[PDB]
Structure formats: structure tokens, C-alpha cells
């Protein structure tokens, strides 16, 4: 079906009345399913709204306000799911559809609106509006939202045509014979669950239907209450992950399909991405990024802060800016990649009268702590008082150095009172030189092996006039015993450029937990990685050889094929929508139950499933 998103402007008019009509016409032309909200506002008289007769489903709310057009042909609108609310709990608001002439919305022929899932409706200040007073809303709106209805019908001075005599209790949406209200809920018998087709229990609708049904089966609903897979209304789309007994592991279900609004699709439509919860979304929102898998786009959560490039000193708005001050530091919030330079000069903390800039607050320096990339250089000749290291740059890893200071240096840290550099994550300096001089309390500076960070042939380093190494070594300000001979950025083992043996996370350690330690580990690339929580720690041996439960030496609880699992699969969904149940024998090994044992077993055969 043809699908459109919808609008959310509420009561805001887009330019002139014609401009507002054009944007509304572009959105809902040939639209059958509205993913968002349906907002019909500021539609003047004699405007052709014939394109609204194709709308059948709306997920959010329906807003019809400030319209002077007499007929809004929402003829084929069947369901208002109410996934969003207009004001507080309104899934349908028809408010103030008149003008100074007091001749506004007169004909609202929603003859197929048979159910509203969530939310109430509101009608207020709609003169000359006919027939809507006769509608029995108890048959269409949910029974729990009837407590917040707001119906105001004061139209006794307008010329209205009477309902058709064949309408039940005189309830009609419009004047025509087709406009009689189609009751399909309150007239149902007590035995019909949900809705029905007439008045007998032999023509009830399946509880998965929404508006109505042509037959008793599930494939007979007009629209689905929750999801629609192919031609069948289902409570949930087919599971994407199923436990096949062949591989003893959760694998991708070929019949598994994603969720797109109220439909279940094998693939998301064009220009749509799948999320981590199995749904089709227009674009991966905040706190998540986009990545390709199997040639299909998929959303993934951001590794920490998301990528947000920002212009630095000398680019755009920050050109001719002397230093990062209290005026421009507001533009550096959540920035992780600086596209330019960074000046940290004493004029920020002091301020000047020419640029009309107040002193920079030292606490605001933690704003650019998320910065991980600098395309230009880094000039730091000022730093707050009580900070012993570059705390705001502990998450910087790359300085490109396309632009250089004095035609030479790309990293300038001069005339500071810091103790350590604190650049724990700095791993690459592609181009430019490094100058660190004049910091008479700075140690560790001469230890770093800078040829490891360089990337251009000919890069030099100038690190002098700091704290003497004889004074640093006497006070203990030396690299940790666990650091490699390639230097360090501080005393703690978290500051090593590299570890002399192995590492656990970002901290250097003497050895991995192979035979000792509470969390047993294994070694690869000189780094310690935890074993699976199901590999039982061995005394005379290592605990695991890899990551997953396939590489355990001895399972800690139960065994499911080559895997160590906490419990055997009891109640896991399988193929053909048939649950898979297993049991544990004497050796704590998982084996399948009997095919006829639908609710689990404790032993082989039908013995474990008594009557």
C-alpha cells in the first residue's frame, strides 16, 4: 500500500493559505497509510480535497482545525490507532472549523471510521457541522478512553439535512444512504470477543481484527489491530531469531520479517534502515549511527558520543577568533571532531574589552572532553589553576596537522603548571611537529616515543625546559613498572603508551588471568579478554580458548551441543511456530523432548509429560 509519514505542525500555518494547501497536498496525495499524524488545517472553501478519500489508516491522531471548507471527504478512513495524542489523550480533534461568516466545516463523511484504538475524541466550536451529533461514539472509541470525551455540539441555527431513516437509531455521518453509522461493537453478543459482523455469536470477529471482518477467520479482518503479515492479522511479526536444533544456537529465521508501522515486511522499503529492536525507521535517530550489514543498512548505537564534526579556530564563524573563550564555547557542546584549530590562550581566562568577551569559566573547559579528532593543530599556552593534567583532552587520539604553528608544530603545549600531560588516548600525529616547553612542573614528557605517533617522514620534537628528570625520578614521577620502554603520559598504569606484556582493557597489567583471578581470561594480540560466563574455571588448566561458549574447557552448568548454557532451551520459539523444549540428563546435557510434549519434559519419551 502507498504510505506517507504525516505532519506534526499542529496549529501552525505554512505561509499563505495556498502554500499551506500545497504542502498538505504533497504529503497526502495517493497516501493510504499515514505513519504519523493527519493534520488538515487552514483549508479554505472551494479547495479540492478529493485526494483525502484514499486515506484508510492513520497511526497517530487526526487533527481537523481552523478549516472553512464545507466538505472534507475522509470517506475511506477506517482506523485511528492513536499511537500519538494531540493535546493530552485526543486521537481525533475537530476544533474551531468556522470563520467570521460562520460557514465552515459542514460535511464530515467519515462513514468508514469504525474503531479508534487509543485515545479519545474532541469536538468543539464547529457550527454548521451536521450529523456528527447523532454518531454513537461508544461503538468506535475504546471503552477505557470514554471517561475523557469532550463533545460540544451547538449547531441549531444551521441548515442540516436529516439522517437516512435506515440508519440505526438515526445515527449518520452525512446525508447520503452510505453515511449511516455501521455499528459493529456494542451490538455484538456477550460471547463475541472484540467485535462481530451482526448480532449472533456465529459471526463474531477474531480478536486480532480492528474495524470489522467479512468472516470468522483471521484473514477476514478489514484492518488489523496490531500487525499485518502478508494477508493475515498477527499479534507479532514472525520472530527473526529462532533456535534450530541442528546448530544448537540462535540463528536468523528466513521467515522472520521486520516491523514497518503495522505491517511485517521481509525487507524495509527504499531509503529505510532497520533498528536493533527489529523495526523499519526513516533514519537512525540520536544516540545511534548507521552501518551496513549483508548489503542492507542497519542502525547501531553510537560508540560513546556520536560523530558530530564542528568548525575549529580559523574556520567559518571561528575565523579571526584569538582563542576558545566563553563566547564561542557554547558552539562546542557534544563536539567530537574539530575541523580546524584549537587555541587555548590566557586571554580566555582574563578577557579583553575589544572583543566584548567575559572571562572564560574554567569549569566549562570540560565541554570539549568528547573531542577525539583535530584536523589542524592544538595550541595550549594556558590552563586552569588546580588541574594537574590536560583533563579535557584525555579522549583525544588523532591530530591531523594540516595547518601548523610557525610553519612547523602541530602540538604546542607551553608555559603551564601541569604535572602530567594526560594525553592517554593520543595514538597518531599524522603531520606537524611537537613542542612542549616551559612547563616547569611537567614530568613524563621526555619518555614518550614520538616516532610511534608520527606518520610523516621528517617530523621532529622539541621538549625542553620542563621539570628535570633528576627531579622527577627523585619524587617518583616516572613511568609505571608495567609500561613499555616506549614511554608514558603519567604515573598510573592507565597512562602507558603500550604495555610491556599484556593489557586488560585500557590498563596495563602484569599477566592475564589464565590460571588465577576471579574472571578467567585468554590472550590474543597481547590483551586479556574475559572467558564466557559459562566456562567453569579450571585449576590445573586454562578455562577457555576463545570468546563464545564453544571454546570452554568445561561447562559450568549444562551443555547444549557444543555450547555451555545456563539452562536448556525450555519454551524457546522454533520453526513452524512450534516451541522447542529440552531436558537435562544425568550428565547435564540438553536433549530434545518428545514431539508431542508441547509444554516441556523432565525425561525422555511420554514419561516426562504425564497426563
Amino acid at each position, epitope marked *: 500500500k502507498k504510505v506517507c509519514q504525516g505532519t506534526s505542525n499542529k496549529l501552525t500555518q505554512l505561509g499563505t493559505f495556498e502554500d499551506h494547501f500545497l504542502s498538505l497536498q504533497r504529503m497526502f496525495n495517493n497516501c493510504e497509510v499515514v505513519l504519523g499524524n493527519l493534520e488538515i488545517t487552514y483549508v479554505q472553501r472551494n479547495y479540492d480535497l478529493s485526494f483525502l478519500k484514499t486515506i484508510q489508516e492513520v497511526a497517530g491522531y487526526v487533527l481537523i482545525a481552523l478549516n472553512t471548507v464545507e466538505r472534507i471527504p475522509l470517506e475511506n478512513l477506517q482506523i485511528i490507532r492513536g499511537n500519538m495524542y494531540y493535546e493530552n489523550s485526543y486521537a481525533l480533534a475537530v476544533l474551531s472549523n468556522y470563520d467570521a461568516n460562520k460557514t465552515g466545516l459542514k460535511e464530515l463523511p467519515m462513514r468508514n471510521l469504525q474503531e479508534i484504538l487509543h485515545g479519545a475524541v474532541r469536538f468543539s466550536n464547529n457550527p454548521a457541522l451536521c450529523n456528527v451529533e447523532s454518531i454513537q461514539w461508544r461503538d468506535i472509541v475504546s471503552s477505557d478512553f470514554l471517561s475523557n470525551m469532550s463533545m460540544d455540539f451547538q449547531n441549531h441555527l444551521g441548515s442540516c439535512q436529516k439522517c437516512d431513516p435506515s440508519c440505526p437509531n438515526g445515527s449518520c455521518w452525512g446525508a447520503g444512504e452510505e453515511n449511516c453509522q455501521k455499528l459493529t461493537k456494542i451490538i455484538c453478543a456477550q460471547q463475541c470477543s472484540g467485535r462481530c459482523r451482526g448480532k449472533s455469536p456465529s459471526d463474531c470477529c477474531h480478536n486480532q481484527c480492528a474495524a470489522g471482518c467479512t468472516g470468522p477467520r483471521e484473514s477476514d479482518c478489514l484492518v488489523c489491530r496490531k500487525f499485518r503479515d502478508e494477508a493475515t492479522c498477527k499479534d507479532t511479526c514472525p520472530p527473526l531469531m529462532l533456535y534450530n536444533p541442528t546448530t544448537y544456537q540462535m540463528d536468523v529465521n528466513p521467515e522472520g520479517k521486520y516491523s514497518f508501522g503495522a505491517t511485517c515486511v521481509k525487507k524495509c522499503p527504499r531509503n529505510y534502515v532497520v533498528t536493533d529492536h527489529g523495526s523499519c525507521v526513516r533514519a537512525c535517530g540520536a544516540d545511534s549511527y548507521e552501518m551496513e550489514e549483508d548489503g542492507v543498512r542497519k542502525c547501531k548505537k553510537c560508540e560513546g558520543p556520536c560523530r558530530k564534526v564542528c568548525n575549529g579556530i580559523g574556520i567559518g564563524e571561528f575565523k579571526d577568533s584569538l582563542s576558545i573563550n566563553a563566547t564561542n564555547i557554547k558552539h562546542f557542546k557534544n563536539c567530537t571532531s574539530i575541523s580546524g584549530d584549537l587555541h587555548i*590562550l590566557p586571554v580566555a581566562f582574563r578577557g*579583553d574589552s*575589544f*572583543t566584548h568577551t567575559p572571562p572564560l569559566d574554567p569549569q566549562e573547559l570540560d565541554i570539549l572532553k568528547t573531542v577525539k579528532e583535530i584536523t589542524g593543530f592544538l595550541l595550549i599556552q594556558a590552563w586552569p589553576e588546580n588541574r594537574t593534567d590536560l583533563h579535557a583532552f584525555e579522549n583525544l587520539e588523532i591530530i591531523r596537522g594540516r595547518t601548523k604553528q*610557525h610553519g612547523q608544530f602541530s602540538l*604546542a603545549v607551553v*608555559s*603551564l603548571n601541569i604535572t602530567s600531560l594526560g594525553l592517554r588516548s593520543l595514538k597518531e600525529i599524522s603531520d606537524g611537529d611537537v613542542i612542549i616547553s616551559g612547563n616547569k612542573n611537567l614530568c613524563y614528557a621526555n619518555t614518550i616515543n614520538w616516532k610511534k605517533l608520527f606518520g610523516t617522514s621528517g617530523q621532529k620534537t622539541k621538549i625542553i*625546559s620542563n621539570r628535570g628528570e633528576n627531579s622527577c625520578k627523585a619524587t617518583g614521577q616516572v613511568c609505571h613498572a608495567l609500561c613499555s620502554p616506549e614511554g608514558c603520559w603519567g604515573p598510573e598504569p592507565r597512562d602507558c603508551v603500550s604495555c610491556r606484556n599484556v593489557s586488560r582493557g585500557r590498563e596495563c597489567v602484569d599477566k592475564c588471568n589464565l590460571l588465577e583471578g576471579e574472571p578467567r581470561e585468554f590472550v590474543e594480540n597481547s590483551e586479556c579478554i574475559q572467558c564466557h560466563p559459562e566456562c567453569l574455571p579450571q585449576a590445573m588448566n586454562i578455562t577457555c580458548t576463545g570468546r563464545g561458549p564453544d571454546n570452554c574447557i568445561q561447562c559450568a552448568h549444562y551443555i547444549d551441543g557444543p555450547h555451555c548454557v545456563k539452562t536448556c532451551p525450555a519454551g524457546v520459539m522454533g520453526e513452524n511456530n512450534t516451541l522447542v523444549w529440552k531436558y537435562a540428563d544425568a550428565g547435564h546435557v540438553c536433549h530434545l523432548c518428545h514431539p508431542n510434549c508441547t509444554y516441556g519434559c523432565t525425561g525422555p519419551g511420554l514419561e516426562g509429560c504425564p497426563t
Partner: antibody
Amino acid sequence: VQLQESGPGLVKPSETLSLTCTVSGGSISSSSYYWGWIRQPPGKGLEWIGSIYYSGSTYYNPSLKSRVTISVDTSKNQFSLKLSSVTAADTAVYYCARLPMVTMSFDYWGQGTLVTVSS
Amino acid sequence: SYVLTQPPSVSVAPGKTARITCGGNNIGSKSVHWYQQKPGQAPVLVIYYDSDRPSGIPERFSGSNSGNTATLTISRVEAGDEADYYCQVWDSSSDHVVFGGGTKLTVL
């Protein structure tokens, strides 16, 4: 030959002293250097007057705050110095030198010009 | 502001080592820069950052800064080294820069 000084060598007392420093061989609109004025009376020592960045931010000498106004214009590629209410003690050779930010020392010095105040 | 103290005159034998001092209230925490000004010429940066040497300065020029006195040490003094020497420091917080009184170095 990079930094060139210019201005009237004769100045009467109590009037404004005007001097201009013209930069050549590069661009004064650089983020790597300050621009400073340094003077020394005949037979005395150097005295820093003030520093100017090409954006307009200034730093002055505490002994010459109220009488010194240093500006810079990027189009003409130059920065000037103005000293109001001049006295007999301001007779000096006025140098303009380049002041990088990586060292905060005066890299390149101009040859300076001598302005003498008299009746 | 900050004050720098230099000896007015220092003499040295040809080929020997000359040591020009620069006094300052805890000048060891700051970076000192030395300039050489021959008569009639502009000052020339001979040493920056306490001890470093710009390109174009002979190795004979060495510097040291500790406590409250910085020292400009000329290794093998020649006849052409007779000039005025000024030590210079840049205040970090104040952003001001102060020069010394000068030192007329004379070769015996």
C-alpha cells in the same frame, strides 16, 4: 626587510605620536604570531610597548596603558602604534617585531626608526 | 609588574667563558629569552626557552635557568661578541613581556 617602520621622525610635546609597521614577505593575518612594539631610549634598555593580534585584541605595558592605542588593518597588511600626550622621556628608537605564540619571544626584529621629540 | 635585574657590565678574557645573569622573583618557574644587540643594530634572539638555540646561532651560546637567576653562558668568547644582552620573559597570566636592564659585554 620584512618589517618596515614608518612615521614622522619629529614630534612636538603633548601631541600624539604616530608610527606604522608594514609587513612584507607574508601575511599579517596569521594565527601563529603576535605583533609587538618595542622602544629603547638612546643609551638605555629595551622597553616593550604593546602587542597586537590581527583580530584586534591588544596587550599593553602597565607604565603606558592610558596613552598607548595599538591598532591593525588587514587590507593594508600593517599594524600601527599611537602614543598620545608625548613627553621628553619618550625619545626612543621604536622597533616592531614578530611575536610567535609557540615561544612568546621576538623571532624577527625590525630595524626600527628613531623619533625625537623637541620644542 | 615583574622586574628583571642584570649586571650593567661584564668583562671576559678572549677565548674564555662569560656568564651573564638575569635576576627575577622565582624566575625558575618562567621561560627566559636572551637577545644580542650590537651597537646600531636591532636585537637578535640568540637563546630562547632558557637554553635552546635558534638556527643561525653558534653552539658557544648556552643558557640555564633555575631558582631566581637565569644565566646566559658564552663558551668561547670572540672579539665580535661585544654587544648588549637583554633577558626577556613573558608572563603567562598577565600576557605582558618584560625586558632586563641590559648588559654591556666587553672583551679584554
